[PDB]
Swiss-Prot record, chain A:
Component of the U4/U6-U5 tri-snRNP complex composed of the U4, U6 and U5 snRNAs and at least PRP3, PRP4, PRP6, PRP8, PRP18, PRP31, PRP38, SNU13, SNU23, SNU66, SNU114, SPP381, SMB1, SMD1, SMD2, SMD3, SMX2, SMX3, LSM2, LSM3, LSM4, LSM5, LSM6, LSM7, LSM8, BRR2 and DIB1. It is found in: Nucleus. Functions as a scaffold that mediates the ordered assembly of spliceosomal proteins and snRNAs. Required for association of BRR2 with the spliceosomal U5 snRNP, and the subsequent assembly of the U4/U6-U5 tri-snRNP complex. Functions as a scaffold that positions spliceosomal U2, U5 and U6 snRNAs at splice sites on pre-mRNA substrates, so that splicing can occur. Interacts with both the 5' and the 3' splice site, as well as the branch region. Has a role in branch site-3' splice site selection. Associates with the branch site-3' splice 3'-exon region. Also has a role in cell cycle. The gene is PRP8. The MPN (JAB/Mov34) domain has structural similarity with deubiquitinating enzymes, but lacks the residues that would bind the catalytic metal ion. Present with 468 molecules/cell in log phase SD medium. The lineage of its organism: Eukaryota, Fungi, Dikarya, Ascomycota, Saccharomycotina. Signal peptide: none annotated. Changing residue 105 to K: Severely impaired growth. Reduced growth at 30 degrees Celsius. Strongly reduced growth at 16 degrees Celsius. This is Pre-mRNA-splicing factor 8. It comes from Saccharomyces cerevisiae (strain ATCC 204508 / S288c). Residues 7-237 are annotated as: RNase H homology domain. It comes from the Eukaryota.
Swiss-Prot record, chain B:
This is A1 cistron-splicing factor AAR2. InterPro entries: AAR2, AAR2_C, AAR2_C_sf, Aar2_N, AAR2_N_sf. GO terms for biological process: spliceosomal snRNP assembly; spliceosomal tri-snRNP complex assembly. The keyword Phosphoprotein applies. Its main location: cytoplasm. Present with 7330 molecules/cell in log phase SD medium. It comes from Saccharomyces cerevisiae (strain ATCC 204508 / S288c) (Baker's yeast). The modification Phosphoserine is found at residue 236. The lineage of its organism: Eukaryota, Fungi, Dikarya, Ascomycota, Saccharomycotina. The gene is AAR2.
Length: 237, 300
C-alpha cells in the first residue's frame, strides 16, 4: 500500500525503487495581457525521478514545446510524467528496473498504473511522507540545465555527490530532505548558509559544497535553526 | 399462459416469481404458479422462513420445456426439474388447476414492468453466463461469485459475466493510455460491442440480467457487473444515440423497481454521482436523472 514513517527503512533496502515527483513538470508565470486579462506563459520543467538508495537522479527536462496546442495542461502533465517514467523503465536493463515506484502525489497513481500495465510486477505506491522534492529547482545546477534546455533532454545526476563514501543512504536521504526542506522554507537563507564560506566550493561534478564531516554537522544545525526560525515566523509561536 | 407446478411445499418459504412474492406455510397445500406470460424469461426464487441465508432461484422460459419445482429433503432446497412426459405434465397441471391449488401470476394489463426489466434478456445468453448445460433452466443464489471476483473459487458454480476492467491491457491501447482511460469509447465500441457482445442488445441483456441477480438474490458480484456496464457507457464520449436513449429507459425501470429500503446496499454512490453529474453522458440520461433525484436524493 502507502509508504510512511512505519515502513521508512524500506527505502534503503536492496529492492530497486524510485521516487517520482511531478511538482515541477508543468510550470508557468502568470501575467496581465494588453487588454488587462490574465494569461500564463509555460517555462521549462522537469520530472524528478530518484533512487533513494544510490542517489541516482533521472532528471527528464520537460521543454515548453510539449505543451504547444494541448488542452487541460495540469491533467496532461500527470500523463506525460507517467509516459516518461514508463519510457525510462523500458530503457533500463531488466536487472536495473525498479520493483516499486513511489509517487509523491496521489494524482500520479492512475496515470502511472495505466502506463505500466505491461509491468504488472512493479508496485505503484503513494506515500504519507511530505517530501520537499518541489525544491529541486532551488539546486542551482539542476535549475540551470532545465532553463537552458532548447529540446527534451534526460540528464543523470547523483543527488548525494560522494556522500555514500562516508555515510549510509538513510543518513544521505535525511541530509537531502533537510537541505530541500530548508530551501523550500526560505531559499535565500538556505543558499546563504550553503555558500557563505568561499573556501568551501562545489566540485564541477557535484551539486553541493565539499563540506567535511564536521562542517556538515554545522550546516545541518544551521538548516534546522532556519526551519524552526521560519516556523516561529509563520505561526507566531 | 404456462404453469410451473410444485409437487408440494414441505418447508415454510417466501416464493418470488419475477417482481412478485408470496408467503407459503410449512405443508400448505400449494401446488404452483399458473398464467405465467409466454414471451419473457422468468425467475422463480426462494427464501426459507427458518434461514433467510441463501436467497436462491431459477431462470427459465416455459417455451423451452415443462418445468416443475420439487423440494429435496437431502439438499434442503426447492429444485427446478424438467418433465419430459408432456401428457403426465398436462394431467398434473389440469388436476391442480381444477382444485385451485395454484397462485396466479398477478400481472396488471397496463403494467409493462417485467418486459421493461427483461427486454434484452434471452435464456440462451443466461445459459452462457450460468454454465449447467444438462438443464434448460439456470440456478443462481446470493453467494455465487463471478469469474472476475475469482481472479482477485469453484469455476463450475460461477457467474461468467464479461470481465470489464478499466485498468487492463484490454481497455487501453499502447500509446493511447490517457485518451483510452479518460474516454472509454474504444473499449465500449471496438472491444466490447464489435468484439465480444457483437451488438448493443446482447450488452443490454447482460446489464439487465446482472441488475436482476443483484436485486432478487443480493448477489454482490452481479451488482459490481451492473455498475461496471453503466460506467463503461457513461465514461465513453462516443456512444450511438439509440444506445443512450435505450440505456436511459433501462435504468429508469431498474431504479423504479428497486425496493426503497435496499438503495443503500444496491446503489454505488461514486458510480451514480460520476454517471449523472461528471461523465460525458451526464446530460443524456434525463429519465434516470429525474427518478434518481426524486427517489434517492440522499445517495447524490
Amino acid at each position: 500500500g502507502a509508504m510512511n514513517s512505519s515502513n521508512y527503512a524500506e527505502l534503503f533496502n536492496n529492492d530497486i525503487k524510485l521516487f517520482v515527483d511531478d511538482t515541477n513538470v508543468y510550470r508557468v508565470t502568470v501575467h496581465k495581457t494588453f487588454e488587462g486579462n490574465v494569461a500564463t506563459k509555460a517555462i521549462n520543467g522537469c520530472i524528478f525521478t530518484l533512487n533513494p538508495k544510490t542517489g541516482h537522479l533521472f532528471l527528464k527536462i520537460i521543454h515548453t514545446s510539449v505543451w504547444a496546442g494541448q488542452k487541460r495542461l495540469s491533467q496532461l502533465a500527470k500523463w506525460k510524467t507517467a509516459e516518461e517514467v514508463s519510457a525510462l523503465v523500458r530503457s533500463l536493463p531488466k536487472e536495473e528496473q525498479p520493483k516499486q515506484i513511489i509517487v509523491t502525489r496521489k494524482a500520479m497513481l492512475d496515470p502511472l498504473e495505466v502506463h505500466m500495465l505491461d509491468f504488472p510486477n512493479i508496485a505503484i505506491r503513494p506515500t504519507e511522507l511530505r517530501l520537499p522534492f518541489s525544491a529541486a529547482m532551488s539546486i542551482d545546477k539542476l535549475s540551470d540545465v532545465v532553463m537552458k534546455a532548447t529540446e527534451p533532454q534526460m540528464v543523470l545526476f547523483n543527488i548525494y555527490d560522494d556522500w555514500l563514501d562516508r555515510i549510509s543512504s538513510y543518513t544521505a536521504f535525511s541530509r537531502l530532505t533537510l537541505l530541500l526542506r530548508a530551501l523550500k522554507t526560505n531559499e535565500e537563507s538556505a543558499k546563504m548558509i550553503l555558500l557563505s564560506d568561499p573556501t568551501i566550493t562545489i566540485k564541477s561534478y557535484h551539486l553541493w559544497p565539499s563540506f567535511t564531516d564536521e562542517q556538515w554537522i554545522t550546516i545541518e544545525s544551521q538548516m534546522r535553526d532556519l526551519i524552526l526560525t521560519e516556523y516561529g515566523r509563520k505561526y507566531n509561536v | 399462459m404456462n404453469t410451473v407446478p410444485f409437487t408440494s411445499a414441505p418447508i415454510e418459504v417466501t416464493i418470488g416469481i419475477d417482481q412478485y412474492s408470496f408467503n407459503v406455510k410449512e405443508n400448505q397445500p400449494f401446488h404452483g404458479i399458473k398464467d405465467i406470460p409466454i414471451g419473457h424469461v422468468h425467475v422463480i426464487h426462494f427464501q426459507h422462513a427458518d434461514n433467510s441465508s441463501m436467497r436462491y432461484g431459477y431462470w427459465f422460459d416455459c417455451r423451452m420445456g415443462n418445468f416443475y419445482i420439487q423440494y429435496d429433503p437431502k439438499d434442503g432446497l426447492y429444485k427446478m426439474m424438467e418433465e419430459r412426459d408432456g401428457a403426465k405434465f398436462e394431467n398434473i397441471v389440469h388436476n391442480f388447476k381444477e382444485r385451485q391449488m395454484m397462485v396466479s401470476y398477478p400481472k396488471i394489463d397496463e403494467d409493462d414492468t417485467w418486459y421493461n426489466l427483461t427486454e434484452f434478456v434471452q435464456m440462451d445468453k443466461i445459459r452462457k453466463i450460468v454454465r449447467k448445460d444438462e438443464n434448460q433452466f439456470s440456478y443462481v443464489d446470493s453467494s455465487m461469485t463471478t469469474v472476475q471476483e475469482n481472479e482477485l473459487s469453484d469455476p463450475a458454480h460461477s457467474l461468467n459475466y464479461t470481465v470489464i476492467n478499466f485498468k487492463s491491457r484490454e481497455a487501453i491501447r499502447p500509446g493511447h493510455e490517457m485518451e483510452d482511460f479518460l474516454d472509454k469509447s474504444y473499449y465500449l465500441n471496438t472491444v466490447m460491442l464489435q468484439g465480444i457482445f457483437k451488438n448493443s442488445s446482447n450488452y443490454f441483456g447482460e446489464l439487465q440480467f446482472a441488475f436482476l441477480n443483484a436485486m432478487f438474490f443480493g448477489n454482490y458480484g452481479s451488482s459490481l457487473q451492473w455498475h461496471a456496464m453503466i460506467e463503461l457507457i457513461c465514461s465513453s464520449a462516443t456512444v450511438p444515440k439509440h444506445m443512450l436513449d435505450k440505456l436511459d429507459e433501462i435504468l429508469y425501470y431498474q431504479i423504479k423497481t428497486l425496493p426503497e429500503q435496499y438503495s443503500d446496499i444496491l446503489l454505488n454512490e461514486r458510480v451514480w454521482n460520476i454517471c449523472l453529474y461528471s461523465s460525458f453522458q451526464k446530460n443524456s440520461l434525463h429519465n434516470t436523472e429525474k427518478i434518481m433525484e426524486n427517489k434517492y436524493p440522499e445517495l447524490l
